[PDB]
Amino acid sequence: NLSKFCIDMTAMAREGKIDPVIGREEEIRRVIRILSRRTKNNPVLIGEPGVGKTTIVEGLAQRIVNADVPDNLAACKLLSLDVGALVAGSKYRGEFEERMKGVLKEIQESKETIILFVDEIHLLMGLKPMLARGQLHCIGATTLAEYRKYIEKDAAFERRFQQVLVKEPSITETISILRGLKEKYEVHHGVNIADAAIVAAANLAARYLTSRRLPDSAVDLIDEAAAAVRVARESMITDVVGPDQINEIVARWTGIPVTRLKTSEKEKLLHMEQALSKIVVGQKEAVQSVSNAIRLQRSGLSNPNQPPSFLFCGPSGTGKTLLTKALAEFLFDDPKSMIRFDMSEYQERHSLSRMIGAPPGYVGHDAGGQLTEALRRRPFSILLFDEVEKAAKEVLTVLLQLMDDGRITDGQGRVVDAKNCIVVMTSNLGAEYLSRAIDPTTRELVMNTLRNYFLPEFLNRISSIVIFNRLTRREIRKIVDLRIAEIQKRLTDNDRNVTIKVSDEAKDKLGAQGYSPVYGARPLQRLLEKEVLNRLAILILRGQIREGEVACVELVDGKVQVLPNHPD
Amino acid sequence: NLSKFCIDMTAMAREGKIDPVIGREEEIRRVIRILSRRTKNNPVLIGEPGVGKTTIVEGLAQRIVNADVPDNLAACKLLSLDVGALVAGSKYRGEFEERMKGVLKEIQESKETIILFVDEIHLLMGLKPMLARGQLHCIGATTLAEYRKYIEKDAAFERRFQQVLVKEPSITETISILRGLKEKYEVHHGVNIADAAIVAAANLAARYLTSRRLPDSAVDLIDEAAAAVRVARESMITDVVGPDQINEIVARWTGIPVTRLKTSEKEKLLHMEQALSKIVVGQKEAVQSVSNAIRLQRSGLSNPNQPPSFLFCGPSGTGKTLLTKALAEFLFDDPKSMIRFDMSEYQERHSLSRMIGAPPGYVGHDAGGQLTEALRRRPFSILLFDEVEKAAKEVLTVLLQLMDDGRITDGQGRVVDAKNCIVVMTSNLGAEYLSRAIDPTTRELVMNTLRNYFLPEFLNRISSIVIFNRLTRREIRKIVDLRIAEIQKRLTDNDRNVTIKVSDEAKDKLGAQGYSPVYGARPLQRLLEKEVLNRLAILILRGQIREGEVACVELVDGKVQVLPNHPD
Amino acid sequence: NLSKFCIDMTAMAREGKIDPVIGREEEIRRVIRILSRRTKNNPVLIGEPGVGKTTIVEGLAQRIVNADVPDNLAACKLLSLDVGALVAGSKYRGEFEERMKGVLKEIQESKETIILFVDEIHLLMGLKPMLARGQLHCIGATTLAEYRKYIEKDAAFERRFQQVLVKEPSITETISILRGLKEKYEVHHGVNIADAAIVAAANLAARYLTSRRLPDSAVDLIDEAAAAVRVARESMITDVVGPDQINEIVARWTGIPVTRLKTSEKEKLLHMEQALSKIVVGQKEAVQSVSNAIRLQRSGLSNPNQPPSFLFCGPSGTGKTLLTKALAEFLFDDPKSMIRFDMSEYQERHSLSRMIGAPPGYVGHDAGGQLTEALRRRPFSILLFDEVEKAAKEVLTVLLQLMDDGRITDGQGRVVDAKNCIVVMTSNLGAEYLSRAIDPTTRELVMNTLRNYFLPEFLNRISSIVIFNRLTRREIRKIVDLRIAEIQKRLTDNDRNVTIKVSDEAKDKLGAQGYSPVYGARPLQRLLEKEVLNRLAILILRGQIREGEVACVELVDGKVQVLPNHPD
Amino acid sequence: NLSKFCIDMTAMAREGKIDPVIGREEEIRRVIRILSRRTKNNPVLIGEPGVGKTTIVEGLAQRIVNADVPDNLAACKLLSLDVGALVAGSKYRGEF
């Protein structure tokens, strides 16, 4: 028996050893149709890594062995290749090819019509199976990449193969197939599940694990997750899988407390400005506006195809970048979700390859376009593009393609999908009117400046064009108060606890200094940090300042100096 | 005997396993003739993917087997190795060349008259049987490009060969080819079809799926029909194929109602004004003008090789952009069928390289050809160009040499087809002559100030001469009403239902406001959108105007504002 | 039965033949969960070799035999595989392959469920146990490198498997392991120990960059030293192992003086500035800044993970290199701690990639990029960074990340951060701005320069910024005086021992001849060598000066000559 | 260590394979004090071709090796790089 590398799934059907799967049924009938297609019986699938496309094939074979398909196929048979154990059981070609030939005749002398499948089928190309004369029956499945690079290249294959593209799973239909596997899995150890828990878990892998992604793979991951959950429950403890544990485990996989996640994504929409003010202050109006706009996107009352768009028109120190990051965090629960891009790093036009990718005949195809790659990695994020006035107008047009539509394509045919992120932009090109005051006229005149800067349609993409304001004394004082709070935090990080006591005029002088004409107070932050921390730690380790005291931050002699309370 | 690599076509001829496509006899005659060419016996066929010139050589083999050939060719054995059949068993080029010799030994063994064929035969370049004086006979085919890449190089080989062009099959000929195939396939499936529906299908594959190539594509279609049958008939009585299933599949590959396909393409012609009005309003004169122009195009009474062209003189977006859009989505029935081109970037000579190309050894030539692949993939499309007068004069030169001839050279070295394109130049170089009201003088003033810009005959190959205007306040308000209508539509898209009640007062207000001498009020679209979307979504996420609750879009004190229905 | 070489660890457990190891319990529960599920029953241990890396499924078996394990898994029975024991049949797979064949079924003939251990199976395969579809239970112990090499490559491997993380058994936690193992090593060797002796042993072993991993070195050296003490005792002497013994043991194993084991590395960190001066002086701000910063990282008041980070400017090699080396010795008394890194090379991006590991393609798979290489091999080292502005921005971001306690996956995969390395960066051309004295003025311009050429947060997390001044006369004198004292000493190394007294005024002329406003302390050593060593050799081989003399050297006519005492 | 393209003029002096040139010695002091400067000590000689301005440069070096030096330039090394053959001989400017 030269089934040494194949076993019959249809047997397991007649042996009741494989469950069914749902979805793709129309595609199943598409398959069968092609299986009777005269010019090419043998189709090919295009599936993201190992969803269980196989399972689709076996549900097909199941309906078959349930006597429900055309006779030309109802009398057929299906094996399951181990392409590995062939390319691994033999040394190299020469005998691997010989084992092939050995099975082929047996296939050539199959007592009835039969089908095989080959996972990663492109393996055979990375030719020999040129005996396919119609009496042979196989299908394929891989990413568009391998299919293109190996089988799409072949003449006879093309003339004898059919793309069968599948698509990403969908939330509701997942929910369904989840309910489906629910029973068999509950049988697997004898405890049942909570429905809303499943719904949640699904949505958690949807909005989350945004790198560990879902050809329904991440679905099965939710599933094995629930499995581990019941195992914990296997170790009072009800029979149903509690949502609490769902959250605990998605956390233990990503590290976020459950509170940050059960916000309905709208409870946050009730206190966005709260959090932001708690972080950044100075353009509370811009805060409210951007919150409204992102709600529009989130409420979908706008075009459900134009992702949000924002440009900033102020200097740093105020919190612009601090805004961007705190925004993302409050909206995505991860700081690293930020992805930075410099238009100085893309003022070079030919860098479009590093931007999106390059044709395989370009040396830069070693990586491609890291931005598009992070896109492939990051559905849920916000994307940084600062000071475009130098950047290429063509990559700008690509940003457009994104904006008006929600996606672009690469250089290698691989289109992208960005229906879940936001573009953010910044400017500081209005330093002319930039003053400490409210004169929206000046704001409007800088707006005219930006209008004449570049293409008007580009403006017609930035919905709520927002501009900053030179930080008034009061808000500076507030940021310094938050600074001393940060210092007290860092102190309290351990049993080191001595009450910071900053003089008012100390802070006032600190700020009056720290307003750099350009760089903002971000330098002053680190400067005063050095100022304190140095003599602070000095008096700490030296015992000149000891625990349980008042860190009397004193601007003595018109300059901040950490006054100890004990000698050396 | 290493004759395995070839295949005796004449065998299956004897076994009758072959089914000849018909027509193209004269070409086969040409073949025979070159087979009598004592100088260069070996010809070379040249065609395109899909046409399977394999078909042709098989038909020649057919005329062999029935002894209906010139007896100088009677005993000739016609076989064909695959070059891939030797790319497989090759541990190195030497071993490649080893098997080459081995078979060639059997080959050079002059047992009886024998003739060979090789597909992609250029691949032998990248040869070994340059020893072939012509004591032997072979034949092959490939694209023009790699042929020029490889065979053009050697004097000997290129001289020994004869370049023959297969040519594109006639649509009427394809129907005849389908006929001869009909009974065969029907036997293969036990089905019947109406010849006329088949003709329709053919014409459909013609008008779409340009990715593929007739006729084998149309075959594929019929195969899919048989597939749907072999589902249905075996799932009163449903046994035959109507146009319905054809339509199902053309839709499944284009996503379009059979309505838009079951057209005959005459009523749409007779009623384009209807659709337009229901899309665009304000240039009825140009509407009917372009309508009759494209009618003349389809009438046949037009010049057989003069694709259309339409002058634009007016502000942008006012409908003319929307016009072009509607033109696409209604005539060719695809939005993307429009390909914009900003001549503002084509005011440079190197923009000729960037658009169509230049001699192959340049940097811009790779950007060029944007029209070439466009037409190849989209015959039925339109070519947008904006403010062309500023574009470099060689750009306008090559654009002309296209539009006149319906074909233009490219930097790659070829002249594309354009028999289904439409020329579009767009600007408002004299629109400022006008008020909100039509005077032929300002019209004639633009006539002069534009015919001057070039050869007025360069403007006199344009299919027409067309201007625009500044919309009447009343029809301004009309397109406003259109807007608010699509906005109420967007409202109804989500289950939140609220009645847009745009007061004629607010109507006039917004209209006049956004009405600007630059683009009319196209930016006002987004302006009023901000005016409404903002407030409505505010009250949506605040809980003020509930479902159904009115949105009286009313102008209060010179500032339109929706009265909050229920204050917070 | 093929119980030839496997080991059912249930026996070793029941008969107590296993020592109770503690630590890493989460992994125990988690792998239990892995065993329970249906999709990925079998995990694999990922990690470099180690007693802990080995003694894992042991403690699992112990929790098993103690009946504190899942019931559905309680029935299982331990097992393990021995590669070297089974492969003893032949050279290649061969009968050893048939040995694996014979043992495969053995679980099928196990009515009671069994659980096996097979590490390194990826070597045993990269195919056989494709039958692991629900019929067996096993685990392996390997590394992520070899995992990606063999197992990750097969999708089915994943589809049956997951990973596990054993990355870092903490230093204090390795000490805790040994705190438990105290009594066991006692009853083995029959010798008490002062726990703190083993503590410090482990601490220094950690400071000592051995290929042995953190607990690996611990078990190894502690148990061999216990064997040494137990054999020395039978041949005062109490059972308590002497701490001094272990101190000198490790001191000689590394070759570093036991003096490092003294000084507590605390007071030497308080009086560090003494040594700092005693190498080079003239920049009090340097010594104070860096010493207080390193004490700060030691005191943990700052971020307790990233070590302090420094950037400097001004002169070149005038002591900055000297500073690097001197500090390397101050911390660790070892030159190899210093690691060179040159930014003149890494201007290129592929240079960056090669500096950070190596993909399997595009480059030979080296163990890691020279930088990442050194980081992986040696965690107690010096991170030099010269003229970093020469390099490109991407590696700048890399080093930002690293400074912030960051780490990046490498070719081997493991991320590496400077857990105990010392980082520093350099700028230039400040001194040219720095006029004679230190001013405040120039430092503002140069710090703003640093800002506007780089990233503000990138300048954050940097300890401080210290610049120097062109060397004065006093300091020139001192540095050259100590230099020539070193000269005298290193020639005294040579048995020829003449004393050296030179004209301090000729020394003044010497330094003025030597010091440059550009290269400072770099050339003078060369100059002194040139003037001195050959004079010495000529005089000694000349007899004009022999031992017991004074190497009097005096300036004469702008020339300073080593005046002899015994002319020919 | 690609000094291969450059010759240690100072060595050649100490090698003594050179010819002691005279005249323009005040110019020697000129360029000497120039090199003593810190403002901009890197001068260019206004030189008509064919004057053997080379000979001048080498006279400079020769005096340099022999205590005829402002002590700041005690052990500076005048060397000689064939800039011409270096630049023009490169068929591709990248290697250049």
- Kindly give, in sequence order, each residue whose CB lies less than 8 Å from that of residue B196, ignoring residues fewer than 6 positions away: none
Cα separation, A230 vs A242, whole angstroms: 9
Residues from A contacting B (CB-CB < 8 Å) are: 29, 32-34, 36-39, 70-72, 127-128, 130, 154-156, 159, 269, 292, 295-296, 299-302, 393, 456, 460, 463
Q: Which residue has the tokens 């878990």?
A: A201
Helix ranges, C37-170 (H): 51-54, 57-65, 71-74, 83-86, 94-108, 121-125, 144-146, 155-160
Q: Do chains B and D touch (3 or more CB pairs under 8 A)?
A: no
For A190-208, give one letter per residue: b (16+ CB within 10 A) or e. ebebbeebbbbbbbbbbeb
Output the CA angle A553-A557-A562, nearest 5 degrees.
25
Taking CB atoms and an 8 Å limit, are A456 and B231 in contact across chains? no
Q: How far is CA C216 from the centre of its chain?
A: 15
Nearest beta carbon to residue B537 from set A33, A38, A292: A292
For C400-435, give one letter per residue: b (16+ CB within 10 A) or e. bebbbebbeebbbebebbbbebbbbbbbeebbebbe
Task: Give D-chain residues touching C558 at CB under 8 angstroms.
Answer: 67, 71
User: Quick one: three-class SS letters along C288-328?
Assistant: HHHHHHHHHHHHCCCCCCCCCCEEEECCCCCCHHHHHHHHH
Taking CB atoms and an 8 Å limit, are C33 and A228 in contact across chains? yes
Q: Could you count the other beta carbons within 10 Å of the beta carbon of residue A66?
A: 12
Written out in words, the top-level CATH class of the domain with range A6-165 is alpha beta
Taking CB atoms and an 8 Å limit, are A224 and C156 in contact across chains? no
Helix (H) or strand (E) holding D80: strand D80-81
Taking CB atoms and an 8 Å limit, are D74 and C514 in contact across chains? yes
Nearest beta carbon to residue A227 from set C37, C154, C460: C37
Helices and strands: H and E segment counts in chain B: 23, 14
Cα separation, C538 vs C521, whole angstroms: 27
Nearest to D38 by CA among B536, C561, B383, C470: C470
Helices and strands: H and E segment counts in chain A: 23, 10
Q: Could you count the other beta carbons within 10 Å of the beta carbon of residue B16?
A: 9
In angstroms, the Cα distances linking A265 to A199, A222, A260, B210, C37 are: 15, 21, 10, 46, 32
Task: Give C-chain residues touching D38 at CB under 8 angstroms.
Answer: 517
Nearest beta carbon to residue A37 from set B223, B490, B496: B223
- Kindly give, in sequence order, each residue whose CB lies less than 8 Å from that of residue B100, ignoring residues fewer than 6 positions away: B86, B128, B129
Taking CB atoms and an 8 Å limit, are A540 and C304 in contact across chains? no
Find out whether B427 and B313 touch, Cβ atoms under 8 Å: yes
Cα separation, C528 vs C486, whole angstroms: 12
The DSSP string of B72-114 is GGTT-EEEE--SHHHHSS-SSHHHHHHHHHHHHHHHHS-SS-E
Strands laid side by side in the A338-339 sheet: A309-311, A421-426, A381-386, A338-339
Q: Could you count the other beta carbons within 10 Å of the beta carbon of residue C59?
A: 21
Taking CB atoms and an 8 Å limit, are C513 and D67 in contact across chains? no
Q: How near does any CA of chain D get to the CA of C83, in Å? A: 52
Burial of C250 (0-12, 13-18, 19+ CB in 10 A): buried
Q: Which residue of B has its CA nearest to A158?
A: B50
Q: Going by CATH, does the domain composed of B473-562 fall within 1.10.8.60?
A: yes
Taking CB atoms and an 8 Å limit, are C154 and A84 in contact across chains? yes
Q: Could you count the other beta carbons within 10 Å of the beta carbon of residue C113?
A: 14
B342 secondary structure, DSSP code: B
Q: What angle in degrees, to the nearest 10, is found between the helix axes of C473-493 and C504-514?
A: 100
Nearest to B384 by CA among B431, B328, B429, B467: B328
Find out whether C235 and C260 touch, Cβ atoms under 8 Å: no
User: Quick one: three-class SS letters along B180-225?
Assistant: HHHHHHHHHHCCEECHHHHHHHHHHHHHCCCCCCCCHHHHHHHHHH
In angstroms, the Cα distances linking C86 to B270, C11, C99, C110, C143 are: 86, 21, 7, 21, 22
Taking CB atoms and an 8 Å limit, are C530 and D75 in contact across chains? yes
Nearest to A57 by CA among A134, A158, A140: A140
Q: Which residue of B has its CA nearest to A457?
A: B523
Q: How far is CA B248 from the centre of its chain?
A: 21
List, by residue range, all CATH 3.40.50.300 domains of chain B: 6-165, 260-467
Nearest beta carbon to residue C130 from set A85, A491, A534: A85
Taking CB atoms and an 8 Å limit, are B536 and A39 in contact across chains? no
Fold of A260-467: Rossmann fold (3.40.50)
Question: Does residue B561 sit in helix, strand or coil?
Answer: strand
- Kindly give, in sequence order, each residue whose CB lies less than 8 Å from that of residue C289, ignoring residues fewer than 6 positions away: C310, C463, C464, C466
Nearest to C182 by CA among C207, C167, C201, C206: C201
Nearest to C272 by CA among C331, C323, C317: C331
Q: Which long-range contacts (CB under 8 A, 24 or more apart) does B284-293 make?
A: B285/B466, B286/B310, B286/B323, B286/B466, B286/B467, B286/B468, B289/B464, B289/B466, B290/B327, B290/B464, B290/B466, B293/B463, B293/B464
The bridge status of strand B559-562 relative to strand A162-165 is: unpaired
Cα separation, C272 vs C280, whole angstroms: 13
Find out whether A49 and A216 touch, Cβ atoms under 8 Å: no
Nearest to B24 by CA among B177, B158, B184, B187: B177
Find out whether C345 and C390 touch, Cβ atoms under 8 Å: no
Task: Give C-chain residues touching A220 at CB under 8 angstroms.
Answer: 39
Nearest to A142 by CA among A72, A208, A77, A83: A83
- CA end-to-end span of chain C: 95
- Kindly give, in sequence order, each residue whose CB lies less than 8 Å from that of residue B337, ignoring residues fewer than 6 positions away: B328, B329, B378, B380, B381, B382
Q: In this structure, is the dihedral angle defined by the CA atoms of residues B23, B26, B32 and B34, taken in order, positive or negative?
A: negative
Identify whether B215 is preceded by a cis peptide bond (ω within 30 of 0): yes
Taking CB atoms and an 8 Å limit, are A299 and B234 in contact across chains? no
Task: Give C-chain residues touching D74 at CB under 8 angstroms.
Answer: 513-514, 527
Task: Give C-chain residues touching D76 at CB under 8 angstroms.
Answer: none
Structure-token pair, residue A568:
């050396």
If phi over 0 gives left and psi between -120 and 50 gives alpha, with beta otherwise, what is residue C453? alpha
Task: Give B-chain residues touching A130 at CB under 8 angstroms.
Answer: 82, 84-85, 88
- Kindly give, in sequence order, each residue whose CB lies less than 8 Å from that of residue A166, ignoring residues fewer than 6 positions away: A24, A27, A45, A46, A47, A51, A53
The DSSP string of C219-263 is HHHHHHHHHHHHHHHH----SSBPHHHHHHHHHHHHT--GGGGSS
Nearest beta carbon to residue D67 from set C517, C526, C559: C559
Q: In this structure, is the dihedral angle defined by the CA atoms of residues C459, C462, C464 and C468, taken in order, positive or negative?
A: negative
Cα separation, C315 vs C427, whole angstroms: 9
* Interface A:B, Cβ pairs < 8 A: 69
Cα separation, A422 vs A420, whole angstroms: 7
Q: How near does any CA of chain B get to the CA of A394, in Å? A: 11
Q: Which residues pair with B384 in a beta bridge?
A: B424
Length of chain A: 568
Structure-token pair, residue C482:
């100590």
Q: Which residue of D has its CA nearest to C523?
A: D75
Q: Which residue of C has its CA nearest to D75?
A: C527
Cα separation, C394 vs B179, whole angstroms: 65
Find out whether D66 and C507 touch, Cβ atoms under 8 Å: no
Q: How near does any CA of chain D get to the CA of C512, in Å? A: 6
In angstroms, the Cα distances linking D66 to A5, C293, D60 are: 89, 50, 10
Q: What angle in degrees, to the nearest 10, is found between the helix axes of A53-65 and A25-35?
A: 70
Nearest to A226 by CA among A267, A181, A258: A181
Q: How near does any CA of chain A get to the CA of C561, in Å? A: 50
Position B176, amino acid: S
Nearest to C468 by CA among C344, C317, C309: C317
- Dihedral Cα B176, B182, B183, B185, nearest 10 deg: 140
Structure-token pair, residue A450:
């930006």
Taking CB atoms and an 8 Å limit, are D74 and C513 in contact across chains? yes
Cα separation, A427 vs A418, whole angstroms: 24
Helix (H) or strand (E) holding D81: strand D80-81
Taking CB atoms and an 8 Å limit, are C513 and D38 in contact across chains? no
Find out whether C104 and C138 touch, Cβ atoms under 8 Å: no
Question: Does residue A46 sit in helix, strand or coil?
Answer: strand
Taking CB atoms and an 8 Å limit, are D75 and C557 in contact across chains? no
Cα separation, A452 vs C210, whole angstroms: 64
If phi over 0 gives left and psi between -120 and 50 gives alpha, with beta otherwise, what is residue A81? beta
This structure's resolution (Å) is: 5.1
- Kindly give, in sequence order, each residue whose CB lies less than 8 Å from that of residue B42, ignoring residues fewer than 6 positions away: B34, B134, B137, B138, B139, B160, B161, B162
Cα separation, B53 vs B24, whole angstroms: 11
Cα separation, B118 vs B129, whole angstroms: 13
Nearest to B357 by CA among B301, B409, B280, B410: B410
C132 secondary structure, DSSP code: -
Task: Give A-chain residues touching B48 at CB under 8 angstroms.
Answer: none
Taking CB atoms and an 8 Å limit, are B496 and A301 in contact across chains? yes
In angstroms, the Cα distances linking B551 to A290, A302, B358, B481, B502 are: 24, 17, 59, 15, 8
Q: Could you count the other beta carbons within 10 Å of the beta carbon of residue A10?
A: 21
Considering only CA atoms, give the Rg of chain B.
32
The neighbours of chain C, by the rule of 3 or more Cβ pairs under 8 Å, are A, D
Cα separation, B92 vs D24, whole angstroms: 74
The bridge status of strand A381-386 relative to strand A421-426 is: parallel
Q: How near does any CA of chain B get to the CA of A36, in Å? A: 7
Task: Give A-chain residues touching C29 at CB under 8 angstroms.
Answer: 235
Cα separation, B328 vs B322, whole angstroms: 10
List, by residue range, all CATH 1.10.8.60 domains of chain C: 473-562
Helix (H) or strand (E) holding D53: helix D53-64
Find out whether C117 and C138 touch, Cβ atoms under 8 Å: yes
Q: Which residue of B has its CA nearest to A288?
A: B538
- Kindly give, in sequence order, each residue whose CB lies less than 8 Å from that of residue B365, ignoring residues fewer than 6 positions away: B353, B357, B358, B359, B411, B412
User: Quick one: three-class SS letters along B390-404?
Assistant: HCCHHHHHHHHHHHC
Nearest beta carbon to residue C509 from set D38, D71, D75: D71
Mutate to test the interface with D, among C434, C513, C531 (most CBs of D within 10 A): C513
Output the CA angle A88-A91-A95, nearest 5 degrees.
100
In angstroms, the Cα distances linking A394 to A224, A387, A391, A398, B473 are: 45, 15, 9, 6, 38
